[PDB]
């Protein structure tokens, strides 16, 4: 039916130029202009600018002027946007959406690409156990993590007790430490003493091939 | 260009509530402004435009009102399942949203169990010491985590990450490691852990006496 559909992650270098699209099928590509929108991690939306295919006019967000290059490829009704001299600062998912006229049904936007921008080469994850040391123990519940530290790029799925611990695991968002990417999750299990079951936390980067298990 | 305040970020809302949202812009842009709703995992879904007009589908408890410059969204009964943020989106000339209303709920606070966790072995015979406090389940999302070595408060080799807010539980957690060289570590002893929360006056602190116990 009518889809926008985006390039896949882009990983660059900084300094360099990425070019990114928005391959409209479904419906006349010159009929609705393309804009293109910035999404801001934490929060936070930003509007790039837009081109018309029919009329041919683009016009840019004085704030993307010198950033963005708006084009389209009419022939094959996919409209790119280029972005040059890539800073850090332009990791984000950017988005292409036709426009909205009048009282329409429902409004189309691209499922987004990501563009994580840095000079950084992929690396397996470190893992290291987190277990309480010789705090007393005599109580309470136990709470297990493993620190999954220093990757590139982000996809890292910390699987719990090979699933088996669902119970509550906290799973706390990955945050950039010198140039590679540091994560962690926590479990807690019922109440004091965990040895029984080696609990184990078991990490996968996808981009890599990499399956540590941690037990103890 | 109109640059377009919006406000607040952050609402705590019960369910069963209502929230106002704000757009007021630099010029008068004539009700040509929209409303978003953006959940994490999909792209924004069009609630309202032109102000007032409603979209197929989009309920009545969604509601939208304003007129210069001036604009105001109105959610009656909060949802479960209404919990996003919301943008709104001038384009009287050219586009320009809102820095965005991100939607929690609001629950009885509750206070964090901390825990503190000394290098792994593992990273010691690597060259390098994190130490790991985790900050479990509490309500509201502030918490300000302060990490001392003998008494020592430390800030650089801090690195802290929250969880997003819990669908089955409604509170949030923390994550606090202080990575530093064996060196520095070894040359040390006491680490400590202190979460100043609104749930209690006094700081809730922990600390680990190294290896010996
Ligand atoms: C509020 C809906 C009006 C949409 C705008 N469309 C009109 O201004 C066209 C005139 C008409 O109503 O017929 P547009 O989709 O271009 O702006 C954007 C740009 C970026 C993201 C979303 C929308």
């Known amino acids: 039916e009518v889809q926008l559909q985006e390039s896949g992650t882009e990983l660059v270098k900084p300094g360099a130029s990425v070019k990114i699209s928005c391959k409209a099928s479904?419906?006349?590509?010159?009929?609705?202009?393309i804009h293109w929108v910035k999404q801001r991690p934490e929060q936070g939306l930003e509007w790039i600018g837009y081109?018309?295919?029919?009329?041919?006019?683009?016009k840019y967000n004085e704030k993307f002027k010198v950033k963005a290059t708006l084009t389209a490829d009419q022939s094959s009704s996919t409209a790119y946007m280029q972005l040059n001299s890539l800073t850090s600062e332009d990791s984000a998912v950017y988005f292409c959406?036709?426009?909205?006229?009048?009282?329409?049904?429902?409004?189309?936007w691209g499922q987004g690409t990501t563009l994580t921008v840095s000079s950084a080469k992929t690396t397996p994850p470190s893992v290291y156990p987190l277990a309480p040391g010789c705090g007393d123990t005599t109580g309470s519940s136990v709470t297990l993590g493993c620190l999954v530290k220093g990757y590139f790029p982000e996809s890292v799925t910390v699987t719990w007790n090979s699933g088996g611990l669902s119970s509550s695991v906290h799973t706390f968002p990955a945050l950039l430490q010198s140039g590679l990417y540091t994560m962690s999750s926590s479990v807690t299990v019922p109440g004091g003493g965990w040895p029984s079951a080696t609990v184990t936390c078991s990490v996968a980067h996808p981009a890599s091939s990499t399956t540590v298990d941690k037990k103890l | 260009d109109i640059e377009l305040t919006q406000s607040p970020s952050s609402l705590s809302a019960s369910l069963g509530g209502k929230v106002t949202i704000t757009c007021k812009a630099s010029?008068?842009?004539?009700?040509?402004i929209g409303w978003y709703q953006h959940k994490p995992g999909k792209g924004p879904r069009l609630l309202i435009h032109?102000?007032?007009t409603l979209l197929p589908g989009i309920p009545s408890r969604f509601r939208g009102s304003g007129s210069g410059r001036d604009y105001s969204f109105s959610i009656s009964n909060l949802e479960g399942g209404d919990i996003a943020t919301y943008y709104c989106?001038?384009?009287?000339?050219?586009?320009?949203f809102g820095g965005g209303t991100k939607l929690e709920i609001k629950r009885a606070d509750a206070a964090p169990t901390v825990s503190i966790f000394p290098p792994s072995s593992e990273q010691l015979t690597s060259g390098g010491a994190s130490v790991v406090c985790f900050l479990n389940n509490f309500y509201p999302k502030d918490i300000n985590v302060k990490w001392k070595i003998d008494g020592s408060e430390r800030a650089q080799g801090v690195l802290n990450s929250w969880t997003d807010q819990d669908s089955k539980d409604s509170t949030y957690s923390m994550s606090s490691t202080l990575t530093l060289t064996k060196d520095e570590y070894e040359r040390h002893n006491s680490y400590t852990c202190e979460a100043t929360h609104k749930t209690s006056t006094s700081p809730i602190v922990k600390s680990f006496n190294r290896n010996e116990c």
């Open positions: 959406k036709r426009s909205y006229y009048g009282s329409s049904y429902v409004d189309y």
């Open positions: 479904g419906y006349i590509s010159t009929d609705h202009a």
């Open positions: 081109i018309s295919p029919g009329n041919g006019d683009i």
């Open positions: 010029q008068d842009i004539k009700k040509y």
């Open positions: 032109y102000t007032s």
């Open positions: 989106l001038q384009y009287y000339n050219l586009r320009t």
